[PDB]
Design a protein around this ligand. Structure first.
Ligand SMILES: N[C@@H](CCS)C(=O)O
Ligand SMILES: N[C@@H](CCS)C(=O)O
Ligand SMILES: [K+]
Ligand SMILES: [K+]
Ligand SMILES: [Y+3]
Ligand SMILES: [Zn+2]
Ligand SMILES: [Zn+2]
Lengths: 560, 556
């Protein structure tokens, strides 16, 4: 068993060759059984296939465990054979490989996450945890999650693997259709942006498409991560001939693509379904001995849901409405675990132009933690958009972040050493960006005071290597409570000038005032003129939204 | 006959004494006839009274003609005696004065301007012109309009006088009540700003109040004009014979008027030669004090002075373009509809009203002259006169009761000289639109027009009487409002007021209220000081108020 430090060192020195397909090989040997069952029924066939790749020059082989998790095995009446299936697979692969690397191979369950399917984050997490336990015990040199179609299920798999072992080399893959999207809508930039910041060692792509079709998809992935890169295309895109799936790409026509992947920074190259030992033999000759290429990676501030990447390069409307403050009905209904009411609020806001939704659960001791976990998992699927998680309690925050399907915005940390560090650390573990509110020991009462908090924040951020993952909220105070909005506008202009995104809790300005719509509208227009890049605001306020649109058109940021 | 250069020279050297009352003196000697009639019926009594004031120390005497104009004499069956009344008055005053100054004295007619009464501007103008001609013929050293209560009537008088003679020394007075207001609502700063820029030589106050009561009113007047200042307080309310304010107490106020820059001091109703004797003893020989006037940019109506030290809403609605019904009433000379539109806009927050007559050549000038005179009285607020025809421009400016804003000259040598000259003659301020031969598109293009304009305005000494309009183009027609916003910020940085025709931004687009609002907020954030806009748009107006509250230009 090699740990992640050893494997990373090896990769830094040499581009490695993976193996070909297993599922599409076994039939050629007269075995059409579920591949994982062969680990018990015919371990000799499994050994032969591994050896076929070792003898073709592979540096790494995958264990015969693609469908070996409880949730998937259950569908085939084999759940009670998890332990021997996985143990035998690892033992067989180790026998074939000798000193070569063995990666524990885990695919997805075929179960969609709730609300598309019935499955909650917690169930996927425990499912992947149990297979990874066996693999780590049996001494794998890494874990690879192949052919994932949904980011929540993949996030669960990575987090479960990392909780079993902080030392194992961990590789996360998605598979993409010909339009460059996963089943639940994630494009390669979103995949990269979301997963780069988790404690995985490598990202990659396998299956669905051939080497030609993957290239631009892989290029986009490579632009947004600095982690190691893996690719395993099919031997051409699958076609049906005389009632069977055929992968028509021959060894030379597949191998010619190696250079193009190498140029994009590939670290491990292999093949998925349709790839045979004949392909791998040629890959071995063509790849030879190469040091991988350095890349940087584009840096962007973006948040995501499964189907939407929201980049802060245009004004971002953050819908404020999922917040039970002053909403007696919503508050009562949240406490009873009503999902439909919150779902309706989400969809309406998006229909009216919210691109991200703030979600707050009021007096958090009064709310069921399981309802928070379900709401957070559900809204990005049903409403399509990313969330701003507006949570006070650090424990509940951890629950929400662990279960969030994408890269969230976390609403909010004040400028306090202890509070900032706690919230930063949670985001470092589970992914995400942070709103930093410019107040602390007290509430600022001028531009200069806000500027001092901003600089204190930057010092704490730099120390935690977190400066690129923040948006600043200068702290809008109520007009009727000596709010002094000119001071906020000065602060917006100042922070924008420094290259940071900004947001405000817009509706705070007009709290306790009649004609709040007009105060909110006037303030938003002024803020945008100073560089304000987003706002938590009411998208159902038609005057606010129409004036916003007019403002963006006028300032040449969009439209007609 | 001294000319105004001669009289000014004298005033620059010494504070002069006027005379006391005539009307109340003639009454007290038992003459209950109109004072002006005595020029025919008892010339020796007129001569006696003038002589008593000269002996008492007056440097200047007033001709006995206070009520001697055609419109006033007609109310007494005496209009056919205008000519002999005024000529005898001047001849008698000259006999009395010797080398001393004789000013032709003209008071108001007692007729209110339409619509408070029935008199139009032109009728007042003709009335004063006739009396000034006779006085100038007979050789006065000046003309003084005493005891005026209305700024339109006074404007007619001063323009009439100046049409007769550009050389005669001209003094314009208003009389103010205890609240510092003329009958039709003009306060001393309004009076000063409106009349200072007309071609008069002095401004002043007489009657209605005593020396003490006039002092703060006179101080206000003194702060807003650099011209010569005159005062003639009355001797209080009589309680008919016996007036309360006697020579010694009246005269002890002279020092306070001297310290405020007074140039001629006299007395009005109830004062006597014995008062003047004391003015002489108290004043002696003093050079007048120098002063620096406060400088502001302001427009006016009889009852309102609007200073551009806060955001000014200029109502756009009296404009028949795209409005078939309004236009049909304008063409049939309907006054009531325009009045209703004016009133509603002011009710909604308009502080100035833009007034445009559409296809001007299809509109009766009488109607225009009538609307222009009427609206400031009934609606209370100043007008932005939005007129293209240069002849109609002259008639509207001439008849306008106050200091107007004139809606628009482009940056063009010929057009500017034309408009500037009319405004120099009739009073007023100018919107200068930043286009010329070509409509500009960029910020630097607009800046070039601005500095072209500044060079033209500086050579005409008109720099201080302009608002700049950067020229807003419709968004659907390659507008680029960002260029306009940059121009506003620049012009503001140079200390100049700005305006825009707001509704042009959103011409042809849907949801125009939202584009108008967004641009207005953005403009204000850059220094925009006014806009021609729709005060009936609740969204616009409420968002405007919010903007000013947020930016600390006004309280919650
Ligand atoms: N490692 C798996 C991939 C299935 S998509 C196999 O080769 O069968
Ligand atoms: N000069 C006139 C003024 C009357 S207000 C007079 O002395 O009678
Ligand atoms: K493989
Ligand atoms: K007098
Ligand atoms: Y620490
Ligand atoms: Zn595959
Ligand atoms: Zn008098």
């Amino acid at each position: 068993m090699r740990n992640r430090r050893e494997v990373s060192k090896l990769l830094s020195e040499r581009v490695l060759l993976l193996d070909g397909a297993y599922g599409t090989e076994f039939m050629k040997y007269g075995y059409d059984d579920l591949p994982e069952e062969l680990n018990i029924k015919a371990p000799d066939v499994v050994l032969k296939v591994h050896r076929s790749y070792i003898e073709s020059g592979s540096d790494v082989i995958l264990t015969n465990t693609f469908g070996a998790t409880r949730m998937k095995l259950r569908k085939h009446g084999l759940e009670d054979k998890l332990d021997p299936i996985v143990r035998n697979a690892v033992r067989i692969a180790r026998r074939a490989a000798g000193e070569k690397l063995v990666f524990g191979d885990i695919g997805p369950t075929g179960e969609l996450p709730y609300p598309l399917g019935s499955t909650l984050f917690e169930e996927f997490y425990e499912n992947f945890r149990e297979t990874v336990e066996i693999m780590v015990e049996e001494g794998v040199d890494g874990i690879i999650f192949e052919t994932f179609s949904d980011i929540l299920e993949l996030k669960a798999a990575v987090l479960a693997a990392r909780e079993v072992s902080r030392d194992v080399f961990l590789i996360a893959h998605m598979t993409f259709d010909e339009k460059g999207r996963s089943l639940t809508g994630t494009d390669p930039a979103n995949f990269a942006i979301t997963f780069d910041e988790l404690d995985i060692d490598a990202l990659g792509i396998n299956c669905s498409l051939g080497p030609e079709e993957i290239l631009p998809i892989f290029q986009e992935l490579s632009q947004y991560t600095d982690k190691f890169l893996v690719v395993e295309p099919n031997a051409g895109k699958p076609i049906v001939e005389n009632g069977k799936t055929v992968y028509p790409l021959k060894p030379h026509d597949f191998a010619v693509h190696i250079d193009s992947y190498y140029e994009l920074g590939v670290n491990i190259f292999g093949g998925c379904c349709g790839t045979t030992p004949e392909h791998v033999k040629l890959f071995r000759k063509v790849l030879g001995n190469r040091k991988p290429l350095q890349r940087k990676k584009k840096r962007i501030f973006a948040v995501s849901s499964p189907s939407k990447l929201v980049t802060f390069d245009h004004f971002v409307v953050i819908g404020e409405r999922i917040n039970p403050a002053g909403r007696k009905k919503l508050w009562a209904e949240m406490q009873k675990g009503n999902e439909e009411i919150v779902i309706k609020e989400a969809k309406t806001q998006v229909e009216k132009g919210a691109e991200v939704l703030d979600v707050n659960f009021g007096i958090e001791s009064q709310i069921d933690v399981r309802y928070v976990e379900k709401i957070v998992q559900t809204l990005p699927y049903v409403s399509n958009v990313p969330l701003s998680l507006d949570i006070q309690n650090v424990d509940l925050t951890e629950r929400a972040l662990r279960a969030y399907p994408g890269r969230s915005l976390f609403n909010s940390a004040k400028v306090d050493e202890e509070e900032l560090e706690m919230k930063i650390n949670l985001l470092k573990k589970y992914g995400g960006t942070l709103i930093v509110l410019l107040m602390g020991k007290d509430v600022p009462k001028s531009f200069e005071e806000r500027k001092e908090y901003f600089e204190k924040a930057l010092k704490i951020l730099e120390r935690h290597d977190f400066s690129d993952r923040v948006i600043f909220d200068p702290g809008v105070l109520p007009l009727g409570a000596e709010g002094k909005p000119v001071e906020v506008l000065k602060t917006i202009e100042f922070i924008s000038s420094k290259g940071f995104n900004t947001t405000v809790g817009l509706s705070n300005l007009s709290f306790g005032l009649p004609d709040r719509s007009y105060y909110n509208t006037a303030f938003l227009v002024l803020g945008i003129s100073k560089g304000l890049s987003s706002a938590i605001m009411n998208p159902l306020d038609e005057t606010l939204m129409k004036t916003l649109n007019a403002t963006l058109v006028i300032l040449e940021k969009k439209e007609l």
